[PDB]
Design an enzyme around this catalytic site. Structure first.
Site, PDB file in Angstrom:
ATOM      1  N   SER H 191     -13.420  22.202  15.355  1.00 28.71           N
ATOM      2  CA  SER H 191     -12.763  21.189  14.535  1.00 28.71           C
ATOM      3  C   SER H 191     -11.524  21.622  13.774  1.00 28.71           C
ATOM      4  O   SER H 191     -11.333  22.801  13.507  1.00 28.71           O
ATOM      5  CB  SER H 191     -13.748  20.602  13.521  1.00 28.71           C
ATOM      6  OG  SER H 191     -14.878  20.031  14.144  1.00 28.71           O
ATOM      7  N   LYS H 213     -25.351  17.091   5.833  1.00 27.06           N
ATOM      8  CA  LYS H 213     -24.260  16.248   5.368  1.00 27.06           C
ATOM      9  C   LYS H 213     -24.133  15.023   6.266  1.00 27.06           C
ATOM     10  O   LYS H 213     -23.826  13.937   5.786  1.00 27.06           O
ATOM     11  CB  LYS H 213     -22.949  17.045   5.325  1.00 27.06           C
ATOM     12  CG  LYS H 213     -21.902  16.452   4.393  1.00 27.06           C
ATOM     13  CD  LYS H 213     -20.717  17.387   4.236  1.00 27.06           C
ATOM     14  CE  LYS H 213     -19.563  16.659   3.592  1.00 27.06           C
ATOM     15  NZ  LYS H 213     -18.292  17.405   3.732  1.00 27.06           N
TER      16      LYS H 213
END
Ligand SMILES: CCCCCCCCCCCCCCCCCC(=O)OC[C@H](COP(=O)([O-])OCC(O)COP(=O)([O-])OC[C@@H](COC(=O)CCCCCCCCCCCCCCCCC)OC(=O)CCCCCCCCCCCCCCCCC)OC(=O)CCCCCCCCCCCCCCCCC
Ligand SMILES: CCCCCCCCCCCCCCCCCC(=O)OC[C@H](COP(=O)([O-])OCC(O)COP(=O)([O-])OC[C@@H](COC(=O)CCCCCCCCCCCCCCCCC)OC(=O)CCCCCCCCCCCCCCCCC)OC(=O)CCCCCCCCCCCCCCCCC
Ligand code: HEM
Ligand code: HEM
Ligand code: HEM
Ligand code: HEM
Ligand SMILES: C/C=C(C)/C=C/C=C/[C@H](OC)[C@@H](C)[C@@H](OC)[C@@H](C)CCc1oc2c(O)c(OC)cc(OC)c2c(=O)c1C
Ligand SMILES: C/C=C(C)/C=C/C=C/[C@H](OC)[C@@H](C)[C@@H](OC)[C@@H](C)CCc1oc2c(O)c(OC)cc(OC)c2c(=O)c1C
Ligand SMILES: COC1=C(OC)C(=O)C(CC=C(C)C)=C(C)C1=O
Ligand SMILES: COC1=C(OC)C(=O)C(CC=C(C)C)=C(C)C1=O
Lengths: 48, 42, 62, 22, 85, 370, 99, 365
Positions: H191, H213
């Site tokens: 990412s 998360k």
């Protein structure tokens, strides 16, 4: 009961003719490529 | 350059005849090239 | 000093890939016409007098 | 280079194909 | 072309290489071809000629292959043959 | 993009000697794609409401351009699928391919999923066989103690096969083939870990050839023969492998007197029919398929393939002849002497697999002194 | 007739027609793979060639001239001493694995 | 594992990075509720609308599955737009393969939602099928032929509804396969992060940090979805689709689903058929050009003030176009929409690339 009757047979004729052509030709293509292997010769030469 | 070396390197003798000439006779020389195989004489 | 058919077919049609393809496109359109016309003729002959196209004249006028 | 002549027979092919096929 | 010119002249350096070029050339060409002639032959080669001559000998031609050692990965002949076009 | 298309096809190492019996894997891939392609196109015109299902199918065959060829290609393609499935499984048993445990067991799941898929598809046109096939097969679950009946009604969406059933079956039949496709890709991934077995049962690492061009052209030749067989059926005898009773709309008040299953389910139906007990027949049915998962544990021979095993070969063909016997019996009325022939054939089936073959294996080992 | 049926069986099995020796046809499991790895160069190389020769005949759906078939009376177990030891070693480890 | 558990991830990705997993969840949700609705839906024009009311009135919990599917499609778009916005702002588009596959994903989801909306065969279903398929009629010479071929006739009818059920049924699974490819290309690079600077010196394992998360994010998505389903199931829908399709009458205030309003405003702003269709196509396809228009020496907009201001102007402009799409074709909306449409392409093609160059100059590189 089967309005498609005449058309499937006309198509069947075309299918048979096309297969009469394509099957031996593809088979010829198969034997062409495979000839490399079908006629290959082996020999064993160990040290001695 | 244009001429490839007598022997291309990468990383035998069983007779007298093939052995004659193998003994060194002069000091060593090392060559390196841009286009040709390296060599070491003597 | 003279080639054979296959040697000529090779030189002008099959060797170059661009020409081996044009040959197939053209051959395909020509084969399609001849094959369909031929097979259709065989089918209609095997069935002479039985198909609508064979008896149609008797009723037409429309 | 050879690309025009090749791109010109590749052109043709596509054309003939569409024309015919479609 | 430049590589070839340099190889030709640098090879004919010393009496032995020249002597050999004389003996072998008379047997192969029937005459000694002078450097000036080799130059004319080289000079006339251009991209078109290289393409045409290479195509003639390499393009879609059957090769002869020889392998020795750990060659499990040497491609199959058919695959090698298709690499010729 | 290159790799895994590639080293997973182009330079895939393959035995130099696999025979035509190894062509069925690619033929199954082709049958799957065919069913999916003709299936989607049929689904573009099919409606799942009981008032219009049968009608939508006749509309496909009578008015949709080339609807008839797509339909009969789908119907007969399902038959080709099974012919190939059975040849594929037979090849595996004969040559000991089942020793590739993961590949084999995934294969057993594939067989069951294709059977379930074909079952549901047959229900879609809502003819007589559609309706009674839906009734009988879903009811197999009623043999489950305590909740069996509840499970059936839940599957049906009611107290009997009706609208809710047909509509969900269209949905199940629609998605299952794609699930089969994903399962088949896993089937192949496990196979690639080992590469293929061959007629001799002996490792072929010393003589591998690239899949392309040798097997790519051989598979194409096989594909042509599959298409010829399919089209001979579609164009010259589209109803040969079908049942006339499904040309009659579903009638919930009447089960046809000579009702019989699709030909590829006849052997299993014969086995279930031979046991005069509900639960017993259902268990025998389930076991007639699941026993395939046991084959690997029943292997006794020191050799992988049956090629060098005469006795095992004889028993193998007896098993095939026996399945042929059960197929024939499944098409006959439950009367004498068929009731007894079928019971013997059913017993012989499990006896050959569980006892006779493992025994032939041991005897052959003894004869070879190991 | 067990020895009589044996020679009959050996020929019916037919791996001899492809020039294979019985041990060339064993199913390879981990014990066998270890035994093959333990073979001396000559036995390993010979095995490789016989298998290669047999796979080649199988691909052509052909067999060797009868005079070249492995003879029942001359077939010997070259792998046995190696495989038997590999199995013994594994058994020993398995015994030790029980407490 | 290594595709999840020990996948290296930047230590600093923010909540804007949660939308990828949320899109995965929206996709699964649509597939699950979709299949269950398909177990009771019938695609014949005589019974489609009826089968949907039957689902909502008589199938046990049919109403919740239906409204979860309808509102789930809206959540899907909210997430898609947030996901794309994150990408533009942070320069995630430099991952070319991942980005272009993403563009395909956006178009496929749009096509998928379009076809689903046609299934209940209400008024909006029918006219949407009419208008959108007709976009193809702008194609010269063969356009009209393509439309009739798609329709299976000379107008939207039974043949259309039945094939649309089939297309809508299979497309989401194709989307799932395309999304898996989307992720595979992403995994080659890992990412991007808010700074636009390589995070190789500070990677943390995806599990447990982002797994927890993502779960927190999933909970918030479900809250938003269920607030809509349980408290305002029709808020984001159109009353006109509660009226069965009427081929003889197009509702006077017909308007597209909210997530298509910006594009509809753009097409409506051009008083020319082909021009409007080209602008529509380009308003989406221009996403494929973003990478070629990147002039900044820096990847993310985090450190670029001027670029940020233009980015929010673009978002505010899409908000303007969304509002205009919901208004009648009357003054002064016609002109506001034309300006907004021009501003959209101007910000992307000219103003942003220019701000990028100016910022470079100001930093002396
Ligand atoms: C319909 C039923 C439903 C199933 C769907 C159909 C699928 C068919 C299965 C796939 C097999 C297709 C295939 O790959 O054919 C290869 C195979 C090619 O054989 P080949 O190239 O001649 O191989 C030489 C042999 O290994 C060496 O053999 P040989 O030299 O002794 O000669 C044998 C050969 C020539 O001998 C003569 O017949 C003369 O005869 C043929 O095989 C013909 O053709 C067949 O076996 C025919 C398939 C029968 C159906
Ligand atoms: C309509 C659209 C609906 C779409 C569906 C919903 C999508 C939701 C996106 C995911 C956001 C949730 C998430 O996982 O981010 C955790 C996000 C990060 O906050 P954090 O765990 O406190 O991290 C501390 C900051 O990095 C350090 O920053 P800090 O020290 O300034 O503290 C910030 C924190 C605490 O500051 C205070 O408010 C005090 O304020 C909060 O975020 C609460 O928390 C939330 O936004 C959700 C908390 C709800 C309970
Ligand atoms: C939708 C069904 C299936 C598909 C698409 C499929 C496909 C394939 C393919 C493409 C191969 C490699 C080529 C070959 O050897 O044929 C293969 C191998 C194999 N399949 Fe299947 N298969 C299917 C069903 C099954 C079933 C029902 C079984 C067995 C219960 C099975 C067992 C095997 C095994 C063990 C192999 C290894 C063959 C060998 O190398 O000897 N498959 N299959
Ligand atoms: C493993 C693949 C498949 C198998 C084995 C299969 C099998 C069957 C069978 C046995 C029938 C009844 C044929 C008859 O009318 O006599 C059927 C019908 C049907 N199948 Fe499939 N099918 C497959 C895949 C598909 C897919 C992927 C779809 C759609 C996306 C589909 C759609 C249909 C439709 C619409 C019918 C009803 C029309 C008809 O009866 O021909 N099938 N299928
Ligand atoms: C069915 C739709 C889609 C799904 C399921 C999906 C899923 C994902 C996932 C799981 C991630 C990783 C988590 C994240 O960073 O958000 C991701 C990243 C990304 N996606 Fe998508 N995506 C979809 C559509 C799109 C679209 C429409 C675009 C843009 C046109 C796109 C562009 C990207 C890019 C550039 C990244 C890398 C983000 C970064 O590392 O900063 N995605 N996507
Ligand atoms: C990318 C995923 C998907 C999206 C974005 C989506 C979107 C939609 C939309 C917008 C509607 C209109 C809802 C309404 O107002 O009634 C709809 C209807 C429907 N969808 Fe989907 N869908 C998705 C996946 C699926 C799948 C996988 C199926 C079924 C296998 C499905 C089955 C249905 C059915 C049967 C209806 C009609 C009943 C209804 O209107 O609620 N959908 N879909
Ligand atoms: C929602 C999905 C469900 C409930 C799926 C269930 C699938 C079950 C099995 O597939 C795994 C099953 C198809 C498979 O069993 C292994 C077959 C060999 C069973 C064959 C089978 O067929 C029949 C049939 O076709 C008929 O047609 C008119 C009529 C039948 O008797 C009157 C039968 C029958 O007596 C049997 C045993
Ligand atoms: C067989 C499959 C086919 C033909 C698929 C086609 C897919 C096309 C595009 O998706 C890629 C398309 C959905 C997408 O264009 C990029 C949208 C943003 C277009 C939005 C759109 O919606 C409208 C709508 O929903 C309506 O509802 C009642 C009514 C409408 O005007 C009266 C519109 C309209 O004027 C436009 C532009
Ligand atoms: C060697 O094993 C395989 C095949 O059998 C010849 C296949 O047909 C196909 C197709 C695949 C992918 C494969 O791995
Ligand atoms: C590396 O990027 C990825 C995510 O972003 C945080 C995900 O949420 C998920 C879920 C996957 C699989 C992933 O690859």
């Amino acid at each position: 009961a089967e309005p498609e009757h005449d058309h499937r047979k006309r198509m069947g004729l075309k299918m048979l003719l096309m297969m009469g052509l394509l099957l031996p030709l593809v088979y010829a293509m198969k034997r062409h490529k495979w000839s490399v292997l079908k006629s290959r010769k082996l020999a064993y030469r160990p040290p001695k | 350059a244009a001429v490839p070396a007598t022997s291309e390197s990468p990383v035998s003798v069983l007779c007298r005849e093939s052995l004659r000439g193998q003994a060194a006779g002069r000091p060593l020389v090392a060559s390196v090239s841009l286009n040709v195989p390296a060599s070491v004489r003597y | 000093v003279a080639p054979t058919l296959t040697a000529r077919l090779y030189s002008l049609l099959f060797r170059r890939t661009s020409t081996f393809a044009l040959t197939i496109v053209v051959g395909a359109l020509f084969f399609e016409r001849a094959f369909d016309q031929g097979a259709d003729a065989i089918y209609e002959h095997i069935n002479e007098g039985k198909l609508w196209k064979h008896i149609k004249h008797k009723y037409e006028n429309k | 280079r050879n690309w025009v002549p090749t791109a010109q027979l590749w052109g043709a092919v596509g054309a003939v194909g569409l024309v015919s096929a479609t | 072309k430049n590589l070839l010119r340099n190889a030709l002249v640098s090879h004919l350096d010393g009496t032995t290489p020249v002597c050999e070029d004389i003996g072998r050339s008379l047997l192969t060409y029937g005459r000694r071809i002078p450097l000036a002639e080799w130059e004319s032959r080289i000079a006339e080669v251009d991209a078109r000629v290289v393409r045409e001559v290479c195509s003639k000998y390499f393009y879609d031609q059957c090769p002869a292959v020889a392998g020795f050692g750990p060659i499990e990965q040497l491609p199959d002949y058919n695959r090698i043959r298709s690499g010729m076009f | 993009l290159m790799k895994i298309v590639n080293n997973a096809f182009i330079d895939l190492p393959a035995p130099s000697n696999i025979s035509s019996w190894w062509n069925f894997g690619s033929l199954l891939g082709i049958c799957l794609i065919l069913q999916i392609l003709t299936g989607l196109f049929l689904a573009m015109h099919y409606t799942s409401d009981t008032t219009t299902a049968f009608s939508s199918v006749t509309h496909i065959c009578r008015d949709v351009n080339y609807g008839w060829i797509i339909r009969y290609m789908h119907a007969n393609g399902a038959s080709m699928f099974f012919i190939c499935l059975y040849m594929h499984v037979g090849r595996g048993l004969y040559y000991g391919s089942y020793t590739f445990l993961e590949t084999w067991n995934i294969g057993v799941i594939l067989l069951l999923t294709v059977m379930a898929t074909a079952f549901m598809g047959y229900v879609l046109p809502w003819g007589q066989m559609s309706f009674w096939g839906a009734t009988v097969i879903t009811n197999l679950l009623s043999a489950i103690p305590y909740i069996g009946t509840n499970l059936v009604e839940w599957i049906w969406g009611g107290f009997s096969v009706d609208k809710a059933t047909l509509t969900r079956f269209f949905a199940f039949h629609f998605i299952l083939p794609f699930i089969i496709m994903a399962i088949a890709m896993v089937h192949l991934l496990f196979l690639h870990e080992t590469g293929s077995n061959n007629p001799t049962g002996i490792s072929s690492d010393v003589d591998k050839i690239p899949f392309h061009p040798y097997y790519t052209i051989k598979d194409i030749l096989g594909a042509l023969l599959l298409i010829l067989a399919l089209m001979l059926l579609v164009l010259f005898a589209p109803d040969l492998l079908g049942d006339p009773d499904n040309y009659t709309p579903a009638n919930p008040l009447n089960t046809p007197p000579h009702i019989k299953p699709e030909w590829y389910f006849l052997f299993a139906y014969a086995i279930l029919r031979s046991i005069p007990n509900k639960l017993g027949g259902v268990l025998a049915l389930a076991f007639s398929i699941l026993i395939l998962a046991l084959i690997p544990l029943l292997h006794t021979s020191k050799q992988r393939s049956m090629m060098f095993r005469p006795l095992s070969q004889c028993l193998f063909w007896a098993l095939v002849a026996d399945l042929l016997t059960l197929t024939w019996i499944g098409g006959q009325p439950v009367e004498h002497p068929y009731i007894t022939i079928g019971q013997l054939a059913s017993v012989l089936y499990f006896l050959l697999i569980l006892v006779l073959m493992p025994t032939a294996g041991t005897i052959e080992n003894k004869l070879l002194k190991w | 007739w067990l020895e009589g049926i044996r020679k009959w069986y050996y020929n019916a099995a037919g791996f001899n027609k492809l020039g294979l020796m019985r041990d060339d046809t064993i199913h390879e499991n981990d014990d066998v793979k270890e035994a093959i790895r333990r073979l001396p160069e000559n036995l390993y190389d010979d095995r490789v060639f016989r298998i290669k020769r047999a796979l080649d005949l199988s691909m052509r759906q052909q067999i060797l001239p009868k005079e070249q078939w492995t003879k029942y009376e001359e077939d010997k177990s070259y792998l046995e001493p190696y495989l038997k030891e590999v199995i013994r070693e594994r058994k020993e480890r398995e015994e030790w694995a029980k407490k």
